Amino acid sequence: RSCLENSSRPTSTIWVSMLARGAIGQRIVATLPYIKQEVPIIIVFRALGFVSDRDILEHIIYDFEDPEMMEMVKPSLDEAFVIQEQNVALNFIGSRGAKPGVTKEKRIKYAKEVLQKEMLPHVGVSDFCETKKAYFLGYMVHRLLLAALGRRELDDRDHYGNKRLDLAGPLL
Amino acid sequence: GFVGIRFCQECNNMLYPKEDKENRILLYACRNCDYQQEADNSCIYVNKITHEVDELTQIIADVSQDPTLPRTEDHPCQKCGHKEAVFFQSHSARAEDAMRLYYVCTAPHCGHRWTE
Amino acid sequence: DDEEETYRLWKIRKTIMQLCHDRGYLVTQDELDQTLEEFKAQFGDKPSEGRPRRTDLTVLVAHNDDPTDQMFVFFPEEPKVGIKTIKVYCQRMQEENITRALIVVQQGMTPSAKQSLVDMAPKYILEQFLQQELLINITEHELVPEHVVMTKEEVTELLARYKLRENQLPRIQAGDPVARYFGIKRGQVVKIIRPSETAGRYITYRLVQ
Amino acid sequence: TVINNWLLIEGHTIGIGDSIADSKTYQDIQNTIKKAKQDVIEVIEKAHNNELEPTPGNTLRQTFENQVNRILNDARDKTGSSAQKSLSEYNNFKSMVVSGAKGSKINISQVIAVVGQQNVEGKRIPFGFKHRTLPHFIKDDYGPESRGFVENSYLAGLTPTEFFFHAMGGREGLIDTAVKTAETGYIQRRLIKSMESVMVKYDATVRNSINQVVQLRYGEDGLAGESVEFQNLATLKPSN
Amino acid sequence: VGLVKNLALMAYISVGSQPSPILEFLEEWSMENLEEISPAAIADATKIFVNGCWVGIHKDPEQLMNTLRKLRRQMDIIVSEVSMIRDIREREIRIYTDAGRICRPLLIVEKQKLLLKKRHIDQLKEREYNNYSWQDLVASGVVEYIDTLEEETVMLAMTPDDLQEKEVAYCSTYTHCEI
Amino acid sequence: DREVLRVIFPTGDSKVVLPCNLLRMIWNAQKIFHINPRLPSDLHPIKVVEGVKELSKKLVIVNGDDPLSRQAQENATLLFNIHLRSTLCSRRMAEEF
Amino acid sequence: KDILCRLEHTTLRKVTANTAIYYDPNPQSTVVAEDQEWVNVYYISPWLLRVELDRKHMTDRKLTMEQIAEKINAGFGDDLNCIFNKLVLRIRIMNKMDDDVFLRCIESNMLTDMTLQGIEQISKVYMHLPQTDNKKKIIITEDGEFKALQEWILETDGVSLMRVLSEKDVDPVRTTSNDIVEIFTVLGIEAVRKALERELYHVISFDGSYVNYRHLALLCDTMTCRGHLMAITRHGVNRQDTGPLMKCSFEETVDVLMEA
Ligand SMILES: [Zn+2]
Ligand SMILES: [Zn+2]
User: Fold this and answer.
1) Would you list the domain boundaries of chain C?
2) Which domain holds residue G21?
């Protein structure tokens, strides 16, 4: 749940999920705000500007020397095979938006606006913030991979350091 | 052991395994370039079931300065001979399978991880 | 294996014998209680090459009240019984002048085959049994109480004593496994005798719907 | 009336003196708790040093939790029975317990001997922090104090961690009361509406509103439930 | 039941602060920003999150944590309600300055001794004659506020009884004590 | 009656729920008529047999004389009549009660 | 334990400890080279699927290498070729949809879907000698006394009552279920009436409480009056021949009155 921490727009949650096993592998997808369908995560990484797979996995996997985490990201690279360029990925984003305009460049601009202002706005909403957004999105994918590998324990809904309290200030 | 990933040199994508029908050898092929490299280890896939018990690599050496972890004097370090070690358990999917105690030496700039 | 198929054939044949005895067909005591070894000696050990043939296991029983009422038991070879083998069985029933038959099928029957079993029900009554259902006698389970199918005179005396109508009795479906076991149709009533921990015995009557 | 007016002569109280055992009993209770905690430490040392082999059907975690919970429950039961043997015939807790009027023997045990193990959703107190039940324990502490075994009685009073673990245990009964009152009432209403018109008719059959026969005789015997009694069949059990 | 809660007596819910002084101090304390690193350096370095934003990596998290604790315990750059959490096992330092964090004061223990002394007590006995108060006790680096995420990395003594040496010692690495 | 009980209660549990607590009623009869259990009794065993028979004839749950109703009557009071013949046995009325 | 192995579902994943898809065009000189000697004893597509089984899971499930191999041969219809003799199988293919990816697909759909032994719906079986005498076998001795003789019983974690009752050395008389619908479809309506009485009695009397039998009997007779299982819901009560005013008083008032 990402909030700008000073401007306080409606908190735009982003989900990065893995599909269940019940397909030749287990597959990571994203649930962006204002995109009514899921997007596979490597298409989101190509929409953010990084086209190569080594760059994307550098943003996701920080040590290349554990191949167990490589084995889990390979299906996500596999269904983003057909998408190899940033505008192609942005068209993939924009063809699933709230109102996909029939103009291709309108879909491109709409997708760029969604991934700039509405995806992870606490990272940054201005221009030249796609590297920081990609680093944080790769961090989310990396945390998901760790929890799926058993390497990190899952988060508690009711742990009270995971909670915040709205007093009179934030409410007013 | 287990298979890694290979990356193309020019376009820097992942290299898929492709079999050539002429030499009948294994070659890793980029599926966006004309790049191909010959295979060195001919194992395409490995799936583990029970051979992932080893958490001793997952342990980092920095955890010795955790004040919330127990410390012991009975188990000395086999590397540097330090008397004091931090012990803890497996923190994973296989935590249900054991209370195997993993020990980390508390000496600064040793960081030796051992078991039993 | 051929040990786990001779056992299956012997078990479904024993269940068929018990079913025929419970329905009032003249089954002798020797074949009601035949040991698996006597089944081996009578038919054979290797159903794969066919020492017991599935069309050799066909049973012809006759009712105790009259030998005219005869009922076949048919063990088709094909796992999915189609229209053509039902027509073969119906032709055999034409030529033998026999009204009732059980088709003990292995895997199932095609939907048109079950429909064709329904369509013949005026002239010939044909019954589907999976061989899974005849690997046990469900009436010998401890949960299943003694069902007795009553004659029409007994049902009339029943409805006359309690001043009843048939729709006021409790019901049992015609596809109930005990109802299928006893071969009872809509409009018949079964007398169910069960022990009672408050009364000792309790006789329930269920109309087939 | 007669008993209430005799109670003016006899009287009945309960005091702080009824919740107090002799020093021999206190020493026995402390010895039992100490030996049980030592048994739990021995089981923990066996599980750390790989000696703990699982019982059939369960992994090492259900067998370790079963062994620790068996040791601690045997502790609580043994020391509660030790507390109850100390009670004189003048004891008022015992007066209300052995008469059945109020309270049970587990109440006497908790007041005098030991409160026992606090349980949240059936297991012991969960690791709500990172592998700690509270930040006053070390990580991966599976001992009795760490996971909610209250070592004191209500007379001796609870330590702060025992107080919090006991509040965690006692919150369960409150939640269960609320949710069971929410759901059981719907179950009762559905039970009523399914059978509200079923009744015994003048031919002694049991019919519903449609006059469909539910039972040919009520209860299969035709009797009402008020007048029947538990009796014993004489001829069922003895040999020939 | 359980859905309506009440604060404990010393519980304080944080008001919120601007993370900018933290970010400037971190930039001037040998922290490498995200935008100016190779991704290969992340693997053996501690990720630094300020208010949930990954802002860079650090190569020496232990002295960084000591420095941030010093700065909060004397309130130079870091105000007292900012929470520094070092998750050692996954190599992340999380700094939170935002509103709504619920925190309580704990006495600080350093080398099995309270930092609260008899001079602090004798000087708090005279709050009207002396103008010495709770805030001078926070500024002394003697008490500090610990929220729930930071509480998960602390080792608490219930009482200073827990700090004297036992014949068999439970923990000799207490970092805080309950008031 | 014993074999029927063995069929009905196959776990050997003798505790049943029945209308008339016969043992307490025998105790009531002993106390009302000051039955000395150290003296010979004046009760003929055939009086016990005939009295239990004619008592079972009037413990009627199903009313009728056709075989359906008398079979339903024999079913509805099966355990109570088994218990009544076991308790008011001519041997127990002479040796025990 | 023989019966418990006959009942419990064991796929291939239960017994495997490792699997790998090597590339080996010549089995005569295999790559892993510890399988080389017995492959030469034994002696195609170049893509080799190699699985490695756990010793213990083979032992206590009483399985053998030829058993698993014949299971794969019968399941896949000799579209593959299994070679067995460490417990190692070496699956190949004899004679667009390339065989490395297809071999991964075969490996994945063989690990979880192929049934080595046991009934498919039964997850786990527990065997235990009982303590309560409701599950002890009760006989009548030569003296006529009731003797509770203690025998091994199995308790599963899933229901397939047809397949369990049909097994050799399983009691087809006393074997039961707590699934009410399973008993209804296997055994009938009087059997599910008795089973419903038993289950409600177990729920009521586990607490130690006692409800008179006639109330349980009336509820079970009401639930099983009309030949099928009448749920105590709007889907069993509001589907009767009762009047619209009775049904609308329970639930779905406006819908009932519209339909009426
Ligand atoms: Zn390339
Ligand atoms: Zn060392």
Assistant:
1) 1-136, 137-209
2) 1-117
